[PDB]
Each structure stands twice: as C-alpha cells, then as structure tokens.
Amino acid sequence: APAICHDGKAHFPREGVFVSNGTHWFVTQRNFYEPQIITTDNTFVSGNCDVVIGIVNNTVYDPLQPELDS
Amino acid sequence: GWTFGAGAALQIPFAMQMAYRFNGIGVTQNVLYENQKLIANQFNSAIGK
Ligand SMILES: *[C@@H]1O[C@H](CO)[C@@H](O)[C@H](O)[C@H]1NC(C)=O
C-alpha cells in the first residue's frame, strides 16, 4: 500500500516501501529484502488521510513510549 | 520502471513508480499523492497538445 493511517494524519516512509506478508506490516529498501519494524523514526507526516488513495489502517510504534514512564 | 532494464522484470504499482521520480528530483513524495488528479488531467491534455 502507499500509506498507513495512525490518527487522522498520514505517514510516509523516508525511503523504500511498505510491505506486508499478511501477518503484519513492515518497511524495506527496494533493492534488497530485509524487513524492519515500523517505527516513528522511519516515516514522517504530511497533510491528512482523506486526500490520498489506497491508505490502510494500523498503528505506529514509538520507541520512546515504553521508556517515557521512567 | 527500471527493474527490467536492470535484469529480470519486476511488477510495481504505477503510482508508486511515479513517486520515485519526484523523489529523484528532490521534491517530497507527498505532493504526488495530494495532487494526482491534477497531474493526470495535465498529462492527458498534453497528449492532446
Ligand atoms: C485496485 O483496483 C480494483 C479494481 O477496480 C479496485 O477495486 C481497488 O479499489 C483498487 N485498489 C485501491 C486501494 O483502491
């Protein structure tokens, strides 16, 4: 898919493309397959979701979220 | 796109292909998604030209 909704806003990968094996969703570079966990620091935000076509539903994990409670 | 020129061909959705060109000329890829309709209308009208 081209993009994934998180909360109202859209997200796009910095490089490579988003892929899915049916189980989950990941991001990878286009010339060599090596899937990676989708994180905040691999994508960035622009506009809202209603503009774009083909967007899907998921959640973006924040590495800081489980450690901000410390 | 360029994959077949590299070697064994690989299919890819067309809009994704258009995205990486704009990545190649320095513009952020969100512009294409936000104005696909205008881009398509201009391309067809240019074919008319
Ligand atoms: C892809 O093409 C099919 C056939 O019309 C269509 O049903 C589908 O909605 C298209 N994909 C998206 C994300 O809209």
Q: Quickly list DSSP for A2-65.
A: --EEEESEEEEESSSEEEE-SS-EEEE-TTS---B--BGGGEEEEEEGGGSSS-EE---B-TTT
User: What resolution in angstroms does the PDB record give?
Assistant: 4.5
Q: How far apart are CA A52 and CA B32, in angstroms?
A: 9
CA distance B34 to chain A (A): 6
The Cβ of residue A18 has, within 10 Å, a number of other Cβ atoms equal to 21
- A64 C-alpha to ligand 1 centroid (Å): 36
The backbone torsions φ and ψ at residue B43, rounded to the nearest 5 degrees and listed phi first, read -65, -45
List residues in chain B that are followed by a break over 2.5 Å (C to N): none
Experimental method: cryo-EM
Pairing of strands A56-57, A43-48: unpaired
Of A19, A56, A6, nearest in space to B13 by CA: A19
Q: How far apart are CA A55 and CA B42, in angstroms?
A: 24
A chain contacts of residue B11, beta-carbon cutoff 8 Å = none
Residue of A nearest to B19 (CA): A2
- A27 C-alpha to ligand 1 centroid (Å): 22
